Amino acid sequence: SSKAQQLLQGLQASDESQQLQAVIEMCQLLVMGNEETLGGFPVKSVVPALITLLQMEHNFDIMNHACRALTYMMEALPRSSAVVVDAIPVFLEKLQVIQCIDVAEQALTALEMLSRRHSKAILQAGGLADCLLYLEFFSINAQRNALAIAANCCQSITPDEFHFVADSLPLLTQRLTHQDKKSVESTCLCFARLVDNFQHEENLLQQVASKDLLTNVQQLLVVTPPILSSGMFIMVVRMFSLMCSNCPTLAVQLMKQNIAETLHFLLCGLVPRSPQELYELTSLICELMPCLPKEGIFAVDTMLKDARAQLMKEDPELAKSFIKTLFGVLYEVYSSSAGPAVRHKCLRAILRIIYFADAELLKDVLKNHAVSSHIASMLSSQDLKIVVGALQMAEILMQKLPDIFSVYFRREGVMHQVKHLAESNNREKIKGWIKEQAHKFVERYFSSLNVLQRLCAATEQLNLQVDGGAECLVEIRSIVSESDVSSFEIQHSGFVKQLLLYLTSKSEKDAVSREIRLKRFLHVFFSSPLPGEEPIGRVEPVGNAPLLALVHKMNNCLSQMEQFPVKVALKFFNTHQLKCQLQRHANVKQWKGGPVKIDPLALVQAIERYLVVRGYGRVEIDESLAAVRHRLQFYIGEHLLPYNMTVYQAVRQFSRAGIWTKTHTIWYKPVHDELWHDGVCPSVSNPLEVYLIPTPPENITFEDPSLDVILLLRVLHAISRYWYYLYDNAMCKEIIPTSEFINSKLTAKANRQLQDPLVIMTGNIPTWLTELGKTCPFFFPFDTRQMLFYVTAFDRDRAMQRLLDTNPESRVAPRLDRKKRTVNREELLKQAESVMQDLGSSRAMLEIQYENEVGTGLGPTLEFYALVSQELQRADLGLWRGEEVTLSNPKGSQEGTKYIQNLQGLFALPFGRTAKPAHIAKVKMKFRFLGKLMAKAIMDFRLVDLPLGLPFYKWMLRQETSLTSHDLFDIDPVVARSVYHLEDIVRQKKRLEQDKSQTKESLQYALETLTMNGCSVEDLGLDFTLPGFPNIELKKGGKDIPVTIHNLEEYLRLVIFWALNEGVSRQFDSFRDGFESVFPLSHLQYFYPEELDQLLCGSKADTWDAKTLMECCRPDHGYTHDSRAVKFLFEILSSFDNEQQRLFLQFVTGSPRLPVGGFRSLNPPLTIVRKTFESTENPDDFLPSVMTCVNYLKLPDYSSIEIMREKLLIAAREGQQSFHLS
Amino acid sequence: MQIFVKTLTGKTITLEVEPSDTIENVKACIQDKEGIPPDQQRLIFAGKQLEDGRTLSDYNIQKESTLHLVLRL
Amino acid sequence: MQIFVKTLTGKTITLEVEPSDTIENVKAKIQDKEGIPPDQQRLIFAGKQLEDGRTLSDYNIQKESTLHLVLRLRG
Amino acid sequence: MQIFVKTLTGKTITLEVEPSDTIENVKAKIQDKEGIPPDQQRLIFAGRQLEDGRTLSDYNIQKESTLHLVLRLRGG
């Protein structure tokens, strides 16, 4: 302030140089300061002096500095803009006539800054035309400021004043077609605000609309790629909705301009869109159509809560064209959504279209569509608006066309539903109206067939007490394949329950055993051999169509009857906080403070820490106790409170408006080896018998009218996956690929439920979704299951981070910790082990720095994960099978180091009973480290590069007891042939022994005569050592016991058991112990053995091409589209064999993997820019630059593709494993 | 090239950038290295309040240059 | 006197060097060998990065030695 | 041929030039008529700034052309 006063006296001077120095020092002091430092500055006296100094035009260099000083005064502290904002007339007058461009630009910037909080003053000053008097021949950076101030002035405009914007309306209307983005957005926002504010005056809307604005907005919307953002897209569509609704003549004019084609192009061109966009588009479509009469059967609308008609009464060609154009698209949108509001809007639009159309048009349009099924399905719904809509639609449609809709309703199950319906005040009134209307309908119209009876006769023969042979099954197959049975007759005639009890029943009272029934089903559907006539060869049928047809019919039926509820505020949650009362349940101090601050997202650990610090934990603020062991515990009722649980969830569950209002109380209180001797092994488990049960599993608790179909589909999926366990010989192959079981509506409902921020804030995913995901995972694709796993498996911060990284959307801001460790590139194993042991279980993200590097961020961590993953495969440790290879392009010291590589996969080596304990201890420690590393990598959304095999994942998912001989092909190929041939021989042995028409000597001679490729078992001379590892005994004494025909099945079983389960048991037990120290294995039950690879490592490798590259790549900063270097690089990228692809990925992103989805899934798109060089050095001998933190590529301009190729390879190869620039 | 940034409290943080970089990238690096969110950060230089979305080549910043960082409340 | 310069992966280049000289001359020779600009190349010797503007005499660099090459590209 | 020049305050100036005359010659004629220093003008025609090294035929400037005169100042 001491210098401020002197600057004031300098400002109040006369010498021009003195004034220039004063203003320069003023701006210098203003820019550097802030609110804290510049406190006490006098503004009420300095500001008028600055205004007076600016009110003079005898010099051109001090005006710029005066405007700059005022602008920086505004920017320094946002408190002076009540007295500083007084020279608005001076600014406007300086804008009227221009002498210098810079002063006008600075005045525009200052005015734009001022307009944020004070727009009424500038509106009264009449600056709407003053700005944009000379809008052209300005700089690019001032046009956006001028348009922003125009929009802010138009934000709050009174109906009384219109002459202030009437002059400039055509200018903005023409400007609405500029090639830039922000200018177009600002002009669109201005027009939207004008239309919204002038909604109750039809004349003003007519004046604003004109005839060029509509067509310009039309071309702006149609032209792609989208130059307009999603929010302003919604705003523009809402402007259309308001103009159409509030002015019928504008709606007619808009219809005359073939808006149907524009809407068709927008909706399909269906392009995936946010629910808000679809809601706005459906509202527009509904508003284009004439209003519904309020008299007649539509009187229920009064309690549930013109010019278009003239145009329809005129030449109806336009209306017919519109209806025929958009009815199909509207129905398609309706049949592919799940949301309370979109469905209602679509229903209203469809009802209006049906009502206002004539007979011929309705007959033509309702040909390739299904309406009766939807009406029947939507009659029975708890939401009591859809029932009324369905009833009205049925009444109107059947009153217009009686003949055609007399058999469809009867077959599809509408008449029965209306009959069932016919057989604190608004609810009663609407119920009474529904009852009366249903009674009138039934009494008036529906008062007084070889498929339903055929199905009933077929399902009568499926009863268990009566034998049926196989004619019933072939009749059912014929009906399912070649007929037109609806989804109502299948329910009406008991078929799903009869089939379920046919397949999954086991009792003495059954006429036919379960095995014969299963064989009969597998013969009628799918071409498996008939029981009792199994061929001596190998089973491999071709036909599988009937099972697919039955599965599709069941899926459609389930989709018809499904009734699961979807449930889709922020300021309330972010602002209001919780207050609770603590009461003793008595060695600790008694609580008397009263209310306790409880954040809605807070955990009980914070409460425990606060209690400990406060001194209530004893048996002054102390930090030693805060700086593991548990001393205090919080209880609510008889249920313990987990540490990883939020107080809001605890109140909701153990203890709505009451959650946030009523006080809650939490109590506190201080805290003979048979295998080695005899040679017997456990039997092979058959997974099918676990699934074959009529009763629902214990995990299922929800009640829905569509549960029997779910159970039948579960049984069918189990049969399809596991069908070769019911035959002595078969090949492993699914009858139906699991991708064909996906339900198109359950997936949509799950995806919609997984997009609400609030249900992830509170973690209130409904029971049905979790239970279905954990019990029947085939109903959803991989992405939905991954999303659900990430949301429900961990804390809320990680879930919201995942949501932000996969769906850009009272603003949410995830909060997380960040702890950094430094390592060295010489002892990576030991340092990684120490880091994992110290910080493995910590709930904070792990970032790793390097000793001689400055770079920090995600790139170093990804590089560390890749290095550790590569290091875990060295041939010195000796943990997996495979061959020894030399890595391509190694480091300085990594050259010559053997690495274990296998073409099929990796499996752990076995040890028997003669292994040194130190070796086993080393193997167990390494396995624990690997398990902990994988568990930590899964949490932090990181990617590894460890090519594991299928049996590894089966072991991980607790499936070690169902490993048959077909699982040796994925481990060791050479021994699989021997095992298969020996099984073929033992089958022949059994077949020979199953004949009683021989003698003992003849039987012995026949057994001995059997040969394998011209050689006998005696000639082979094998033993009880596992092949390939001549140091492991299958059983004690396995050195002097040769293999013979009499002991061959035991030998094969011992080999399989030792090679798959026995010798690799302790290792995987150690792996499970290491993995479960982070998060339990029970959270991986969603996935499948063939799908964990995508979750752990990256996506499958594929060739890159420019067509998919023109979807995420966004070049700028000297590399506009249709340039030379960009196309050269784009062409040279797609010339790799995935090796240079991995090199480029590690060069730019830092990891040799990509997220699921390709180049689009990467949150920071690959942004390519130019690099600045000097005018002397040629722009040819330079290397490209990369910033891995945000994926910022800086690519030098060149002239030859060959030079690009020859320098990119050197850049990738000679610049790895270092961060010397940051 | 190397740049130095200093605050009102008094501390010299050294960064290494390139002329083709972006001011937003520099602010993100400062946020990562210090924890200050890139919303209250104000970068002033030679009297200007430098804006975002531009490059250091525009502001003729050369080797061994000093920048000023002032927060806001 | 044929001092060797070894890159990261596998390449090695001979270089006849004067006893006393600046780093810029050796950099020019390395550029003639490969073509690395004077903006991304860093030299590491023993356990220290060779600072520019000095001579090999003060770095205790004698005849028939090996200098490892590192490119300052990533971020 | 004669062309018209419009500045930031109007003042339509009719200047006689030749198709072979460069933009530098037009600037010299404008300076002779008025006196604006060469380092302050930012002559822009049809929304595009006119390079001094080009000629009228390069910018397709014809008879009765309505040029726009724009001033400029140092940055910082």
Author numbering:
A (entry chain A): 484 to 752, 764 to 799, 866 to 983, 1131 to 1155, 1165 to 1284, 1305 to 1321, 1325 to 1358, 1373 to 1380, ...
B (entry chain C): 1 to 73
C (entry chain B): 1 to 75
D (entry chain D): 1 to 76
Structure paper excerpt:
In humans, a major E3 ligase responsible for generating K29 linkages and branched chains, TRIP12, is central to cellular signaling and human health. TRIP12 regulates diverse cellular pathways—including cell division, DNA-damage responses, gene expression, differentiation, and small-molecule-induced targeted protein degradation. Here we utilize biochemistry, chemistry, and cryo-EM to define the catalytic architecture producing K29 linkages and K29/K48 branches for the human HECT E3 TRIP12.
In brief, TRIP12’s active site Cys2007 was stably linked to a chemical warhead installed between the donor Ub’s C-terminus and K29C of the proximal Ub in a K48-linked di-Ub chain. Importantly, our chemical biology tool maintains the native number of bonds between the TRIP12 catalytic Cys, the donor Ub’s penultimate residue G75, and the α-carbon of the acceptor site. TRIP12ΔN lacks the intrinsically-disordered N-terminal region (residues 1–477) that was not visible in the map of the full-length complex. One sample represents the transition state for TRIP12ΔN generating a branched K29/K48-linked chain. TRIP12’s preference for a K48-linked Ub chain substrate was revealed by the structures representing branched chain formation. The I44-centered hydrophobic patches of both Ubs in the K48-linked substrate bind adjacent surfaces on TRIP12’s ARM repeats. The structure also explains why the proximal Ub is the acceptor: it faces the ubiquitylation active site. The acceptor Ub’s residue 29 (here a chemically modified Cys, but normally a Lys) is situated in a fiveway junction together with the donor Ub and the C- and N-lobes and extreme C-terminal element of TRIP12’s HECT domain.
